[model samples]
Target: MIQVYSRHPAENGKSNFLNCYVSGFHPSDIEVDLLKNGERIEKVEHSDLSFSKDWSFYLLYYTEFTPTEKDEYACRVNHVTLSQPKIVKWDRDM
Candidate 1:
């Protein structure tokens, strides 16, 4: 499963931080992609991508980013457990 969330604002009420998380798969068994308005976001300098093991070899992937209001953010997860990669989207306006 995959999810997107907004972090707490930086006192000014502008939540510049976003998070994308994928779980229920192994460390090397899944591929993850971050998108903005259907366009791929490349190696973002402020972004972080990581994986950790848990729950009987099942690992979790966490991605952190700086979001912009120009578009929606999406997390695409490709795993063996799904027939096709699943996409979870987050609206910047939300």
Candidate 2:
């Protein structure tokens, strides 16, 4: 599990990205979602399995959730079919 969280007062109400790295098994799809106080923002699903091995990467881009009070935000990522869910932290900025 790779987790990173940092607060940047300079980047509040702005957009950033979350990149997931998975290897060993190629996932047929990638799904990304953001939850604020238990509500999902923009739900994204990608069917593109084209990425480099040894470092299979999935990128979640241009998140629409702007921080409003430093609440706990969750970023849930899932594979296409067989693989289980992998979660990471979402913070104020980054």
Candidate 3:
């Protein structure tokens, strides 16, 4: 599964953030990547990316970023469950 969320703060808030989450797979059987306009983005910090296992034994991957409207972003996922990589764009439901 894949999902995206964003937050553009109101006047009093200090920050803006976007989050992309990928889940429902085995931890070691998958890889996750963040991209902007089809190019891989390396701006992520160690803390911005994380993995955890749910109680049901599914692995989850999370990535967060601060982006502008002009930026087009996507998540490129590679997993043993897929024969080809799956690309989930920010603006579309996949």
Candidate 4:
């Protein structure tokens, strides 16, 4: 029989809509959300995209919501380079 010591726990946390910035590719749409332990907290979408030479894009965010110390969060994208997950850790001190 297989035995496991430590168990992964479901995330209990909160998220707030910040802002968004995008670049590189021309995205038909984009979404920004705060995630916890690989779950979505909340979602926000940018207004729109105008195709031009200034098409470089990124997201800027201001979140009033904070997550539990155990919570992990970052931005998610659709129709980008790859469907792989990406993470940008929040500063513990900040």
Top candidate, metric lDDT: 1
State, as a TM-score between 0 and 1, how close model 4 is to the true structure.
Answer: 0.46
Query: How many clashing residue pairs appear in each of the predictions shown?
Result: 0, 0, 0, 8
Give the Å error, residue 37, model 4. 2.2
Q: Mind sharing the TM-score for model 1?
A: 0.59
Give the TM-score ranking, best first.
1, 3, 2, 4
Which order, best to worst by lDDT?
A: 1, 3, 2, 4
Q: List the residue pairs that clash in candidate 3.
A: none
lDDT of each residue in 1-94, candidate 4, tens digit only: 1111112232335434333243454544444444445567554434545455335454343443444655554544554445764544444322
lDDT of 1 by residue, 1-94 (tens): 6777656652333435556666555545566777766667764332223345424233333444554445566777776777888778875443
What lDDT tens digits, residue by residue, belong to model 3 across residues 1-94? 5665555542222344445566665554467777776678765432322255423244333444555546676777777767887766777322
Cα lDDT of candidate 1 equals 0.57
Q: For residues 1-94, could you state the per-residue lDDT of candidate 2 as single tens digits?
A: 4343433443556655433333434454455555554456664344555555423544433343455556556656566563876556564433
TM-score of 3: 0.59
Query: lDDT of all the models against the reference?
Result: 0.57, 0.49, 0.56, 0.42
TM-scores for all candidates: the values are 0.59, 0.47, 0.59, 0.46
